[PDB]
């Protein structure tokens, strides 16, 4: 019960890390491309 | 019980990914700024 609530909050945590990781990958990709284009 | 111990260890895992993600965001930000300044 509280155990299920933990797991749900962990799932919210995870989805936040997924969000950050996709932000970072797009941003690093845009930098690599910029350097390549230069 | 072992179930709770799993969730705790998963929580430690998560906090480690949060640490890495903040390191990476500061570092990518410093690179973007460097390129902008150049």
């Amino acid at each position: 019960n509280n155990l299920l609530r933990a797991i749900e909050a962990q799932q919210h945590l995870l989805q936040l890390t997924v969000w950050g990781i996709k932000q970072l990958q797009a941003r690093i990709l845009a930098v690599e491309r910029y350097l390549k284009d230069q | 019980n072992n179930l709770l111990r799993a969730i705790e260890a998963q929580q430690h895992l998560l906090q480690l990914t949060v640490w890495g993600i903040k390191q990476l965001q500061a570092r990518i930000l410093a690179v973007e700024r460097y390129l902008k300044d150049q």
Binding site: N2, L3, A6, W19 | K22
Partner: peptide, 24 residues
């Protein structure tokens, strides 16, 4: 969402989880 809102949501849910771990 911004990285400031992200930082805060992270902390909010880290706190919730830690209280759910003690309650259990």
């Amino acid at each position: 969402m911004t990285w400031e809102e992200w930082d805060k949501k992270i902390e909010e849910y880290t706190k919730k989880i830690e209280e759910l771990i003690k309650k259990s």
